[PDB]
Ligand binder design. Structure first.
Ligand code: HEM
Ligand code: HEM
Ligand SMILES: *[C@@H]1O[C@H](CO)[C@@H](O)[C@H](O)[C@H]1NC(C)=O
Ligand SMILES: *[C@@H]1O[C@H](CO)[C@@H](O)[C@H](O)[C@H]1NC(C)=O
Ligand SMILES: *[C@@H]1O[C@H](CO)[C@@H](O)[C@H](O)[C@H]1NC(C)=O
Ligand SMILES: *[C@@H]1O[C@H](CO)[C@@H](O)[C@H](O)[C@H]1NC(C)=O
Ligand SMILES: *[C@@H]1O[C@H](CO)[C@@H](O)[C@H](O)[C@H]1NC(C)=O
Ligand SMILES: *[C@@H]1O[C@H](CO)[C@@H](O)[C@H](O)[C@H]1NC(C)=O
Ligand SMILES: CCCCCCCCCCCCCC
Ligand SMILES: CCCCCCCCCCCCCC
Ligand SMILES: [Mg+2]
Ligand SMILES: [Mg+2]
Lengths: 240, 240
């Protein structure tokens, strides 16, 4: 049985590995993944994402094995390894800076302002607000980053990530594609499960069939267009 | 200290998974990897390649983790999974057909004829013969396959594979970049270590520093040019 009371939030120490992903960082901060953020396998991620968020193995195996490429080890990563630019890590993040013009690893409040201020007049973020934020964040990178990369692949990953915050931090059925701002804000700003605030793990499995139409709708509403190269080539390992 | 008498060749049975790679197939056929070809992890590949061939973890971790993408499992593959087109598997193979116009999985004697007939008048294959074979195999694909994919990435993989047969099946120092035809022919045709024929595991470690200049020289001598977009994008998982 999973006992959330047995999984308290603790702030990471200075030598606990944390990465650019709030999903995995939050799992580590609650001990669903190792609190040190090290020696993490795809099986560990699969189990952690299921226990913490009811996210299913389909998306976690797919994403997990791509993430494994970022380390030099046979079958594990440190969470910090995931910052490797151009494997999964991309420009026009929701809460991090572009690597060419800043820190692509740590939560940045100034970047996060765009998301925080989205969906004015409501107490939830939803698909249309998520799309607007993606549009605005990409425009910011195009304006300010002379090395900006924007491809079909980065755009899809970005929509996947928005679909994650909308589903995993939902109050009701994750199908609805909306999440309380108070929950999503805690998730990004503190990398904590907002238990005190009333959040509970989804009782509905979050899998590719559920996420797919949400992802596609976020993309559609974001008014995304190709801007240049558009080759969806990933970096296959570190130090190439 | 490896005892190859403890690792006899046995023909694969009808339920044994085999893939497009003679290196891994041969390891399975000698029980360095599971003879059934199933539930193979990157650690297993690292250990197997070391024990069988003296191939080091640098190349096997890098290649292994890319290979893991081809399955639906968290941290293992079946050898047959590696046939997934556009992850590692490519057009203009040495011993398989292009997927668009034939069987990209099984050894094909007619394809192998080009390699078998290379370096006429010597009893070895070497860097210049390997380069000629790559040139000729690519020309064949460009002639006969309207869907040919030929990129910096596929060209590098192809030269890596040639460097592998030249080094792993060598008689003396793998550094020399030459291997007896009688050894290489058995390797491809029977997916067997040619022990009876006089082959022994290299006493020199085969790693990226050793392979790199061989790879680069094969490419240089092959009179290579890209096709089309030259997009080095890999397929990130099955059933996309
Ligand atoms: C399934 C539960 C997970 C959730 C809820 C989740 C959530 C998120 C969110 C919301 C972001 C966007 C952060 C931003 O734009 O500032 C993100 C980024 C990221 N995630 Fe995850 N994630 C999960 C699993 C994974 C897995 C399994 C990996 C393994 C590769 C991963 C790797 C990353 C990376 C590398 C980024 C940085 C992308 C970027 O913004 O540049 N995530 N994740
Ligand atoms: C252990 C030492 C290795 C050797 C000596 C070796 C040798 C070879 C050779 C010679 C080929 C070319 C076959 C051809 O063109 O017909 C090949 C193809 C291939 N190898 Fe390996 N290999 C090794 C390790 C690996 C590993 C670790 C992976 C992935 C886990 C891998 C995946 C492949 C794939 C997918 C192909 C097919 C590429 C193609 O021809 O389309 N190999 N290998
Ligand atoms: C990582 O985890 C594996 C599996 O539990 C263990 O055998 C190994 O000793 C660990 N390595 C480190 C760095 O602690
Ligand atoms: C998101 O919320 C806003 C404000 O409540 C609303 O106007 C908009 O239609 C919503 N979008 C979706 C897709 O539910
Ligand atoms: C980034 O862009 C600048 C300005 O065009 C250029 O000088 C530099 O070489 C680029 N760097 C990369 C990472 O390609
Ligand atoms: C082993 O491989 C089979 C398919 O051949 C798969 O169903 C099974 O889950 C695998 N198990 C693991 C996790 O190694
Ligand atoms: C090959 O290319 C043609 C033309 O671009 C395309 O219609 C077809 O679907 C492709 N695939 C195969 C394997 O024939
Ligand atoms: C390969 O062998 C042939 C025939 O012996 C020889 O002409 C050629 O120079 C050799 N090339 C290399 C790279 O040693
Ligand atoms: C954090 C999300 C990572 C997801 C990686 C792969 C999913 C994206 C779309 C599917 C693969 C890309 C080719 C269509
Ligand atoms: C199976 C052999 C190679 C497949 C993956 C190679 C990874 C990308 C190549 C870049 C560096 C390796 C050789 C120079
Ligand atoms: Mg980023
Ligand atoms: Mg092939």
């Amino acid at each position: 049985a999973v006992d959330f009371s047995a999984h308290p939030w603790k702030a990471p120490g200075p030598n606990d590995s944390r990465g650019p992903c709030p999903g995995l960082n939050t799992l580590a901060n609650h001990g669903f993944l190792p609190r040190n953020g090290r020696n993490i396998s795809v099986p560990m991620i699969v189990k952690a994402g299921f226990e913490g968020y009811n996210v299913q193995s389909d998306i976690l195996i797919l994403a997990g094995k791509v993430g494994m490429l970022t380390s030099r080890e046979a079958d594990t990563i440190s969470l910090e390894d995931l910052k490797l630019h151009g494997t999964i890590e991309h420009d026009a993040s929701l809460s991090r800076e572009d690597v060419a013009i800043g820190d692509n690893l740590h939560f940045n409040e100034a970047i996060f302002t765009t998301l925080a201020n989205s969906n004015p007049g409501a107490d939830v973020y939803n698909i249309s607000s998520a799309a607007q934020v993606q549009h605005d964040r990409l425009a910011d990178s195009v304006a300010r980053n002379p090395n900006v990369t924007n491809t079909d692949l980065t755009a899809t990953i970005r929509s996947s990530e928005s679909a994650f915050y909308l589903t995993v931090m939902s109050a009701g059925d994750p199908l609805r594609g909306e999440a309380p701002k108070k929950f999503v804000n805690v998730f990004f700003q503190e990398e904590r499960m907002p238990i005190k605030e009333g959040w509970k793990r989804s009782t509905t499995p979050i899998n590719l069939p559920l996420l797919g139409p949400i992802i596609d709708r976020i993309t559609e509403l974001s008014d995304w267009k190709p801007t240049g190269d558009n080759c969806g080539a990933i970096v296959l390992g570190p130090g190439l």
